[PDB]
Amino acid sequence: TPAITLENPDIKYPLRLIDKEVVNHDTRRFRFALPSPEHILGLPVGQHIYLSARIDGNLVIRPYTPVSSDDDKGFVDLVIKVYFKDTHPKFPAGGKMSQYLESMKIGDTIEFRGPNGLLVYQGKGKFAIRPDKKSSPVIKTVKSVGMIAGGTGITPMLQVIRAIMKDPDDHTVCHLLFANQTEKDILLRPELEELRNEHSARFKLWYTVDRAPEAWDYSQGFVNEEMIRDHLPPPEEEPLVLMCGPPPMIQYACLPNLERVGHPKERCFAF
Numbered sequence: 001t002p003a004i005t006l007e008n009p010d011i012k013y014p015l016r017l018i019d020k021e022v023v024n025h026d027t028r029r030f031r032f033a034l035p036s037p038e039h040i041l042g043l044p045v046g047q048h049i050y051l052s053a054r055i056d057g058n059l060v061i062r063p064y065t066p067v068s069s070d071d072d073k074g075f076v077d078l079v080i081k082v083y084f085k086d087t088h089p090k091f092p093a094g095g096k097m098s099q100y101l102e103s104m105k106i107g108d109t110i111e112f113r114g115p116n117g118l119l120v121y122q123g124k125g126k127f128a129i130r131p132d133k134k135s136s137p138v139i140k141t142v143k144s145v146g147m148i149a150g151g152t153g154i155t156p157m158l159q160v161i162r163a164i165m166k167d168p169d170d171h172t173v174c175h176l177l178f179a180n181q182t183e184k185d186i187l188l189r190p191e192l193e194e195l196r197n198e199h200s201a202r203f204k205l206w207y208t209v210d211r212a213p214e215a216w217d218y219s220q221g222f223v224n225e226e227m228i229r230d231h232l233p234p235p236e237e238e239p240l241v242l243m244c245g246p247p248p249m250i251q252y253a254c255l256p257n258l259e260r261v262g263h264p265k266e267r268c269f270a271f
């Protein structure tokens with residue numbers, strides 16, 4: 001089996017930026033070389049890495065979920081939204097790590113660490129979820145999984161979706177509700193729709209956008225009760241519901257509406 005990059009979560013591994021690609025107006029794909037062309041990252045499905053750097057004199061550490069997998073040898077791909085300065089009146093300085101990444105030249109390095117996270121997908125509907133960092137995982141096996149993602153929150157979902165569809169004996173059905181500001185902000189749409197086309201029995205896909213185009217067949221607005229009722233499995237199926245998005249999306253749009261529909265807190269997990 002392949003050499004593993006992340007052997008110890010307490011250790012930092014400097015990886016070299018080798019390629020970069022524009023995804024949309026504010027988002028890019030960054031490809032980093034692993035320690036050798038035959039290495040894999042070593043990242044259990046459901047977990048993430050952290051990038052860290054000293055940026056303008058302060059320590060900055062942020063979590064990312066690669067869009068690559070442990071089937072990929074020799075590289076790791078991150079899809080990252082850049083929060084530019086001088087753009088948002090509420091955040092004139094923009095974002096620290098994302099702008100740092102955007103400023104990197106091919107050949108520059110940045111430290112990776114991992115794997116981390118309370119949730120690990122063990123395949124065939126089986127999730128190992130620690131209540132917190134000091135407790136044993138609770139092993140929950142479900143027939144279906146609800147997923148609510150906003151913006152870059154798609155990456156933890158996509159990692160799980162891909163892991164499932166890869167295994168023809170994994171009968172778990174994923175229902176994704178993916179929220180973004182506008183149509184052009186729907187990250188990884190071609191990948192998601194390719195998955196839908198190939199795995200429609202196991203992958204249900206729905207979008208909402210804050211602001212919708214004229215020709216729009218999906219939903220519009222923040223996540224609401226109707227969207228959760230119509231686009232996630234019903235509470236009676238006892239699915240796990242995973243969420244990843246901006247804090248107010250989780251707090252105000254997801255949780256109260258999950259409760260209205262009848263999904264218990266015990267079934268819900270926020271990345």
Ligand SMILES: Cc1cc2nc3c(=O)[nH]c(=O)nc-3n(C[C@H](O)[C@H](O)[C@H](O)COP(=O)(O)OP(=O)(O)OC[C@H]3O[C@@H](n4cnc5c(N)ncnc54)[C@H](O)[C@@H]3O)c2cc1C
Nearest residue numbers: 063064065080081083084088091094095096097098152155
């Ligand atoms: C499990 C997990 C996986 C993640 N995976 C990814 C991923 O694959 N790709 C990815 O890009 N991110 C991912 N994130 C988010 C990531 O960790 C950071 O939060 C993000 O990159 C921003 O960090 P920052 O240092 O650049 O910005 P920060 O300095 O921390 O400040 C940014 C925050 O302030 C606000 N802000 C600042 N500038 C602007 C602006 N111009 N417009 C709008 N809002 C602004 C935003 O709320 C933003 O979140 C993931 C998070 C988690 C928890």
